[PDB]
């Protein structure tokens, strides 16, 4: 989301912002802000009673985008490259 997710998911391998804990395993725990993993509809802090476990899968770089900037008749043209650093995490959690 804004780094460090939440919600009832069914154990998927989603990609998020960099996590520091290199290679496989690493293991991460998330606060949780809402859930339906057991039909129980619980949200906020009462959701904090629970915590999702996720395993670090892969560290990566995003697809190459190009920063193009332009202003007319002021001779201004800017071309610079960009690639966004990420972390793939396999959800397991309670």
């Amino acid at each position: 989301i804004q780094t460090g997710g939440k919600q009832y998911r069914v154990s998927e391998g989603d990609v998020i912002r960099v996590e520091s804990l290199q290679g496989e395993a690493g293991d991460k725990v998330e606060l949780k802000a809402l859930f339906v993993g057991g039909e129980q509809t619980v949200f906020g802090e009462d959701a904090g009673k629970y915590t999702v476990q996720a395993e670090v899968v892969e560290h990566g770089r995003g697809k190459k985008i190009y920063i193009r900037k332009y202003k007319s008749g002021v001779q201004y043209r800017r071309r610079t490259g960009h690639r966004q650093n990420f972390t793939a995490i396999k959800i397991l959690g309670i």
Partner: protein, 117 residues
């Protein structure tokens, strides 16, 4: 010695020409217009990158008071309750709940109504 252009121009020209994929008429065929089109596209590319970030929040906000009103509330009111019940910090993906899980969305409407009244 004599350093002729040969290859340098054609390579640079073919590059720009290849950015112009499904551009209409001369824009995908002649270098001068192809390159010219791309300057304007540059303006559009940088803008729309931070503009899509306004677009989606708006789509999400729209799907929110669409559901909030379905249970006799509204966005202004529903989000105020979820703010008052501090515990709720959902904000992002509060529209997926509204769209896909009505039962679960009601729970949030009910919780907002309380923290408010």
């Amino acid at each position: 010695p004599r350093a002729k252009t040969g290859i340098v121009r054609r390579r640079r020209h073919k590059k720009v020409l290849k950015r112009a994929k499904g551009f209409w008429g001369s824009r995908s065929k002649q270098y001068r217009n192809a390159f010219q089109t791309l300057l304007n596209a540059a303006t559009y590319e940088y803008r729309d990158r931070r503009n899509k970030k306004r677009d989606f929040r708006r789509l999400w906000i729209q799907r929110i008071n669409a559901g909030a009103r379905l249970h006799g509330m509204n966005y202004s009111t529903f989000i105020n309750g979820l703010k008052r019940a501090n515990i709720d910090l959902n904000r992002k993906v509060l529209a997926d709940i509204a769209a896909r899980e009505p039962e679960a969305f009601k729970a949030l409407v009910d919780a907002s109504r309380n923290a408010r009244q």
